[PDB]
Write an enzyme that holds these catalytic residues in place. Structure first.
Site, PDB file in Angstrom:
ATOM      1  CE  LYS A 161      14.806   8.780   7.717  1.00  0.00           C
ATOM      2  NZ  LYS A 161      16.056   9.191   7.020  1.00  0.00           N
ATOM      3  CE1 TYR A 162      12.812   6.913  11.104  1.00  0.00           C
ATOM      4  CE2 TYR A 162      10.995   8.382  10.578  1.00  0.00           C
ATOM      5  CZ  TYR A 162      12.295   8.187  11.002  1.00  0.00           C
ATOM      6  OH  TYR A 162      13.088   9.263  11.329  1.00  0.00           O
ATOM      7  CB  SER A 163       6.864   1.316   8.305  1.00  0.00           C
ATOM      8  OG  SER A 163       5.912   2.296   7.921  1.00  0.00           O
ATOM      9  CD  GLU A 164       8.711  -1.613   1.560  1.00  0.00           C
ATOM     10  OE1 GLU A 164       8.673  -2.845   1.754  1.00  0.00           O
ATOM     11  OE2 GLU A 164       9.134  -1.102   0.504  1.00  0.00           O
ATOM     12  CB  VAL A 165       1.803   0.174   4.991  1.00  0.00           C
ATOM     13  CG1 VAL A 165       0.359  -0.211   5.213  1.00  0.00           C
ATOM     14  CG2 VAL A 165       2.370   0.822   6.237  1.00  0.00           C
ATOM     15  CG  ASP A 192       3.434  12.214  11.120  1.00  0.00           C
ATOM     16  OD1 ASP A 192       3.493  13.315  10.530  1.00  0.00           O
ATOM     17  OD2 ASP A 192       3.797  11.140  10.595  1.00  0.00           O
ATOM     18  CG  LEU A 205      -1.976  -1.106   1.229  1.00  0.00           C
ATOM     19  CD1 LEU A 205      -2.804  -1.056   2.502  1.00  0.00           C
ATOM     20  CD2 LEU A 205      -2.872  -1.036   0.000  1.00  0.00           C
ATOM     21  N   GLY A 206       2.022   1.244   0.594  1.00  0.00           N
ATOM     22  CA  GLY A 206       2.870   2.421   0.609  1.00  0.00           C
ATOM     23  C   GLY A 206       4.175   2.127   1.313  1.00  0.00           C
ATOM     24  NE  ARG A 207      10.099   1.221  -0.193  1.00  0.00           N
ATOM     25  CZ  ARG A 207      10.925   0.727  -1.108  1.00  0.00           C
ATOM     26  NH1 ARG A 207      11.682   1.541  -1.830  1.00  0.00           N
ATOM     27  NH2 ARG A 207      10.991  -0.584  -1.303  1.00  0.00           N
TER      28      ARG A 207
END
Ligand SMILES: Cc1ccc(N/C=C2\C(=O)CCc3c2oc2c(Cl)c(Cl)c(O)cc32)cc1
Length: 329
Positions: free
Chosen positions: A48-52, A155, A44-46
């Site tokens: 700075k701190y994770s990939e989902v 955030d 679904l997305g990437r």
């Protein structure tokens, strides 16, 4: 003599009255699930701190969302986990359902409830005046809850507000920057996305609090009712403060840094200029006027204030006449 100290005007000492283990996230022990319970469907997305990823719990065919954390720091990973567990069950807080060890990254993977989110670029173009008020109230429920639990999100932005518009469901997500509020503690100012950074971050004032989230929320509200996303569109962190100053004025900015004995970065000497505060009617036009009301502008005025101590708290915001027309559960 250095900056004048500051502290939150609400929920100030919630964490020192709690057991040490509530906020001492460095000592938290993670309870691990079975990573083969979940099959990744698509990314679904990437960030700075994770990939989902969208995923499926193959034990019950239930759709979930898996967030594979990048290697970062045992502190920050445990911090996000501890906060998600402390806040689980709160109104409109995304539910952490499981934690597993991803075999490829060898880092924790967080399993969340699935939200059938509408892309906010597409969704904000369709929101009615009533929808904006409705969803703003839902966000405020989440913010007051986490503030009441001694946590600031840090955030807040459209990307981190998942909305299933067909079912009118909202969840506040990505708690990777969230932090426990301790009075007198100095925090890292490199939080939030540029367009939603509070003036306290932009002037490098470290003793900030929950009120940071309320500035970010005001930025979201301004983008929605004026149909300009983002509202303060700075080219960098310095230009970001100039953009804010061209709307709120420079005199109130100088009063703000004077109150806290903050010295502005001298880089601002040649770019800040002199600006009067603008009336919000300047940003009203035929294409957004149906989203603007006296109540909306009064509410926005009480969120978008330089002085973090003067901004409405989340509880106070829910009392505002802007929400009188919203049917509550
Ligand atoms: C780039 C980048 C960085 C961090 C994050 N963190 C995302 C999420 C969470 O921290 C909460 C669960 C959640 C996240 O993202 C979701 C999405 Cl996109 C959909 Cl659609 C959904 O149903 C649920 C979630 C996402 C993207």
């Amino acid at each position: 003599s250095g900056p004048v100290p500051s502290r939150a005007r609400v929920y100030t000492d919630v964490n020192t009255h709690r057991p040490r283990e509530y906020w001492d996230y460095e000592s938290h022990v993670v309870e691990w699930g079975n990573q083969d319970d979940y099959q990744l469907v698509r990314k679904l997305g990437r960030g700075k701190y994770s990939e989902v990823f969208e995923a499926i719990n193959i034990t019950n065919n239930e759709k979930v969302v898996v967030k594979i954390l990048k290697p970062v720091k045992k502190k920050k990973i445990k911090r996000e986990i501890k906060i998600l567990e402390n806040l689980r069950g709160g109104p409109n807080i995304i539910t952490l359902a499981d934690i597993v060890k991803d075999p490829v990254s060898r880092t924790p993977a967080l399993v969340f409830e699935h939200v059938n989110n509408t892309d906010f670029k597409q969704l904000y173009q369709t929101l009615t005046d009533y929808d904006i008020r409705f969803y703003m109230y839902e966000i405020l429920k989440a913010l007051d809850y986490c503030h009441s639990m001694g946590i600031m999100h840090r955030d807040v932005k459209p990307h981190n507000v998942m909305i299933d518009h067909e079912h009118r469901k909202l969840r506040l997500i990505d708690w990777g920057l969230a932090e426990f509020y301790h009075p007198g503690q100095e925090y890292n100012v490199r939080v939030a996305s540029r367009y939603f950074k509070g003036p306290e971050l932009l002037v490098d004032y470290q003793m900030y609090d929950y009120s940071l989230d309320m500035w970010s929320l005001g930025c979201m509200l301004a983008s929605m009712i004026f149909r300009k996303e983002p509202f303060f569109h700075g080219h960098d962190n310095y230009d970001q403060l100039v953009r804010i100053a061209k709307v709120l004025g420079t005199e109130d900015l100088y009063d703000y840094i004077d109150k806290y004995n903050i010295e502005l970065d001298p880089r601002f000497n040649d770019i800040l200029g002199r600006h009067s505060r603008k009336r919000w009617e300047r940003f009203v036009h035929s294409e957004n006027q149906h989203l603007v009301s006296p109540e909306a502008l009064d509410f926005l005025d009480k969120l978008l204030r330089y002085d973090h101590q003067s901004r409405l708290t989340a509880r106070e915001a829910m009392e505002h006449p802007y929400f009188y027309t919203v049917v509550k559960d």
